[PDB]
Amino acid sequence: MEPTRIATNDRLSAAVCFDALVFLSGQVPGQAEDIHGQTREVLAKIDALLAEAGSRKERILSATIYLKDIARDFAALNEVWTQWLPTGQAPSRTTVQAELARPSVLVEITVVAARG
Template identity: 55%
Template sequence: MPIQRLRTETRYSEINIHNGTVYLAGQLADDHGGDIVQQTRETLASIDALLAEAGSDKSRILSVTIYLKDMARDYAGLNQVWDAWVAEGHAPARACVEAKMYRPEVLVEMTVVAAQ
């Protein structure tokens, strides 16, 4: 079965599809100047758009890994937005870890695996 790669850059592809499974590269907010609520909303909107491009949607997400810059400060704000966004009855497997981000103003990044 071939691998389909969409939005390919030099170092990565935004979307990889193989055998009915969609893999998204780490997604970030476009505007890194906002708080955790704004950055989480933008990140989830990006995930929605990429899943749609891959022929999937948030109800088909299998797992998400969430990277937070500051778990103590931002976990509640992240979950406020996440809980309103996640498809009812379709909560994916999820891990949330604190991580040093590639830029100081980035507060959250998410990687996603979904069924197509």
Template identity: 55%
Template sequence: MSQVVIHNKIVYLSGQIDGSAEDITGQTQNVLAKVDQYLAEAGTDKSKLLTSTIWLQDITRDFGAMNEVWNAWIDPKNKPVRATTEASLASPKYLVEIQVTASLE
């Protein structure tokens, strides 16, 4: 599995997870830091996001806190389309997974 694929000036990031924090706030911050890192390595940044998909282990419990972190992180002038849903993730320790697509231009 690739973490990043670039095709026709579009950057595709696979679903990013991080189980090192025990709460949704910490995990979301850690995952978004990974997203920033991969976007930078690909030659773009969050201001060029096109789409995002977010999976939460428990959407009822964690949506508000995740969304606070997301809103603080996202470029307010360039918000991507986003879908957020509840899903069983690869391990119970993972509370959030985030996938994004961004432009290189």
């Protein structure tokens, strides 16, 4: 059994599958500048990668949520996050403050999920 990959470049693959596990690269926003829009864009990108890798939102196992300013943006993050999640099926989660690769990025989320 060897890992399979989705959207591979010289630095990373957007997803790596092995056994029944899906490992996603941390996903960053599109063009939104605000925390609400950026969180929507991150979660939408995760949604698509899960689909490509044979998983789905109900089968997320863990998410690390990185916020550039956790005090300022935690409430907005939770608002978009809880609406995005399938009811009653929230994953394990860790939310911490960290600067991301670009200063305009307010939120980045790293997901591990189950294939199925």
